[PDB]
Amino acid sequence: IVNGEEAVPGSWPWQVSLQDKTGFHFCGGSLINENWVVTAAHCGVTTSDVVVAGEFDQGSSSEKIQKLKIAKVFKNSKYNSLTINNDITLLKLSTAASFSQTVSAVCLPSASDDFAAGTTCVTTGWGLTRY
Amino acid sequence: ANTPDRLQQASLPLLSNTNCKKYWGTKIKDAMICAGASGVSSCMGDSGGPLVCKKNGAWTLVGIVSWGSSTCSTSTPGVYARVTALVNWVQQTLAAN
């Protein structure tokens, strides 16, 4: 995020960070249940990857983070790697998360819902704060 | 480095797909929703995370960070996967596994 603000720790509890095997952060994700995460199809997630829930500071010397194994990756078959259209993947947790003051799921909209142009939304992540 | 250790959040307005087309023309397809161009931008590393809006006192997933400005320009709108467009696929998947 460029020009964001620091978040209150644990206030965006479905927020997850995916780490590859070498160990660190390559993408964000959102917990929609205790067993499933949604993220982008462009992230190229594979079962070697791990989902980290409960994180605030990727520096945290140690926290009550939960690292989850990914049982199966579900990549939308319509994903266009040239256009980047249908950018989504579903990740089915080998082991379910344990919901708590800090980890919990976001809600899903219905295909018919209307978020009007001008609506105030919020985006979060650990991406670059400056180019 | 420019990578934060603590989680960032930024509030931003959603855009109409035809205002967005202004900026990106033809690269904006069916399943894409734009937001920003208003002093914030998602940036490398933000990919796959959420774009959420409050509905009925609750946060809902409207976007998935997908691509944007080649420089993270805070004046160009980011492009998110539109959930709306993809949630039937998600629900069927969930219903089925």
Partner: peptide, 8 residues
């Protein structure tokens, strides 16, 4: 879903 224990 969607209501954190900790308020943004």
């Amino acid at each position: 879903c969607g209501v954190p224990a900790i308020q943004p």
